[PDB]
């Protein structure tokens, strides 16, 4: 049987090389200079070089003569080894739900939270429910805002209304203030959004969830991506076993410190007071406000209308942020910095302006999500993330603050985003240097340094001795 020999080729022009060698084979197959090679292989995904099937290297060299595209493999050839010749012709070929939330990878809608309105059965795209970032073709010759169909009908351009549904500016589809447009599944980020996966790190205590090895707990020695071959050291066991990720879970007796790796709460820490079936409850270190999370890692009140951290209208003039959920009431941090107790129905849910802009103490533009330092007022010295803005008020969050679930309120002006004689030709009119013309480099209340035009020296004299030109 003949063997395969690597011949280096021009990149991106390997298929054309095989076509030219086949034409060269048929053009000289009856002549006195025959191509004694057997086949030519240029694969689909192997880029840069092709393969010649022959019993000899000299047959390869005398067959590729006259081909310029292989001239970097003309002098020497390398044989594909015998066990590896089948590797030449060898060809190889959850995380997303309806009403879940993803993040688009590109565009102005890059990194924005978007709800999955519809999963396409062909698995090409998903319809996404968004909030548009558009200037309504007025500024174009931005923060998120609700789609005003009357405004885009007023401005005109590419607009087509079909009731609440509307097509605009490149087949952008919108309905009832929200966008509903298909975007590719390869173009969206399906995991870690939190408006399978495995995360195990050496040193954590894990439990065996199934098997004859079930209910062993031990600490992680090492980690791999799938079958972790987690090498746990179980209690009272000096031996290392191997477990696949799917067989494990992150256990924890009550009283140990825990971190929230991913979720609405991620970054927060606490001691777990009670562990339930897959449920785990804990108290945060910043605030004693309760938390219930899954073992691998709700946030909404009973009734589903409101959720912690939301902006509410307390009365016609006063806004606040919900900072504690109770069975009949909320605790709300109002815009003045006081916490009030109100019945769930006594406050109205307020539309948050995610695209709000304000000025900080140094006249910088600040926006929601910005990190600011507090430089005046009661919270001076603190640092926080802007969560909401209203008139002269900013609601901030800092996870280190245990009070009010980390929320606090500051005035925007208490925040910050985290001589005449100089150069004037003078004439010394008194003293030992009298009559010299120079230029004032530095000047004070008393004296001034004069670069003398004549000498190579800068000397200082009194301002009472100088007379300008």
């Amino acid at each position: 049987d003949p063997n395969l020999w690597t011949v280096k080729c021009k990149i991106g022009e390997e298929r054309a090389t095989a076509i030219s060698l086949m034409r060269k084979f048929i053009a000289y197959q009856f002549t006195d200079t025959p191509l004694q090679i057997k086949s030519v292989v240029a694969p689909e995904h192997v880029k840069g070089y092709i393969y010649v099937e022959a019993y000899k290297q000299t047959h390869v060299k005398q067959a590729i003569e006259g081909v310029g595209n292989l001239r970097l493999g003309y002098w020497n050839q390398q044989m594909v080894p015998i066990k590896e010749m089948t590797d030449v012709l060898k060809v190889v070929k959850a995380n997303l739900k309806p009403k879940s939330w993803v993040r688009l990878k590109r565009g102005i809608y890059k990194d924005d939270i978007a709800q999955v309105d519809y999963v396409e059965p062909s698995q090409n795209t998903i319809s996404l429910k968004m909030i548009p970032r558009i200037d309504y073709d007025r500024i174009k010759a931005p923060p998120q805002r609700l789609f005003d169909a009357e405004k885009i009908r007023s401005l005109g351009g590419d607009v087509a209304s079909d009731g609440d549904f509307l097509i605009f500016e490149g087949n952008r589809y919108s309905r009832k203030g929200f966008l509903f447009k298909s975007f590719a599944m390869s173009a969206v980020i399906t995991e870690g959004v939190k408006p399978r996966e495995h995360n195990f790190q050496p040193g954590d205590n894990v439990e065996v969830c199934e098997g004859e090895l079930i209910n062993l707990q031990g600490k992680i020695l090492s980690v791999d991506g799938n079958k972790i071959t987690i090498m746990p050291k179980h209690e009272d066991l000096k031996d290392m076993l191997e477990f696949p990720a799917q067989e494990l879970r992150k256990y924890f007796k009550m009283g140990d410190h825990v971190k929230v790796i991913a979720g609405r709460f991620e970054g927060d820490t606490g001691l777990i007071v009670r562990v339930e079936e897959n449920f785990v409850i804990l108290f945060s270190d910043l605030t004693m406000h309760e938390l219930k999370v899954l073992p691998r890692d709700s946030g909404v009140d009973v009734g589903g209308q409101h959720e912690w951290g939301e902006l509410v209208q307390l009365d016609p003039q006063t806004v606040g942020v919900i900072v504690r959920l109770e069975r009949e009431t909320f605790q709300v941090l109002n815009m003045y910095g006081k916490v009030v107790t109100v019945r769930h129905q006594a406050v109205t849910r307020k539309k948050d302006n995610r695209f709000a802009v304000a000025l900080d103490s140094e006249q910088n533009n600040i926006h929601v999500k910005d990190i600011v330092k507090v430089i005046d007022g009661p919270h001076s010295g603190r640092e926080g993330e802007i969560r909401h803005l209203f008139r002269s008020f900013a609601f901030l969050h800092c996870k280190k603050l245990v009070e009010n679930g980390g929320m606090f309120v500051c005035k925007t002006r208490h925040l910050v985003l985290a001589n005449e004689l100089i150069g004037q030709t003078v004439r010394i009119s008194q003293g030992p240097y009298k009559g010299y013309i120079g230029v004032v480099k530095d000047a004070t209340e008393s004296t001034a340094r004069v670069e003398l035009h004549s000498t190579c020296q800068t000397i200082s004299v009194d301002r009472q001795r100088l007379t300008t030109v």
């Binding site: 030709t425 009559g435 010299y436 013309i437 035009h453 004549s454």
Partner: protein, 46 residues
């Protein structure tokens, strides 16, 4: 504002504005010298 220059070849004072190619309106010569300044110069004779 005027910034009168001097042609290297024909020595002709010719008006040039900012952001224009260095060209002499006659003789096409492309090297220009600026001028002598107007501000006062005081030299000791030492």
């Amino acid at each position: 504002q005027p910034m009168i220059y001097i042609c290297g070849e024909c020595h002709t004072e010719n008006e040039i504005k900012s952001r224009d190619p260095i060209r002499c309106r006659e003789c096409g010569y492309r090297i220009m010298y600026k001028k002598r300044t107007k501000r006062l110069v005081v030299f000791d004779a030492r």
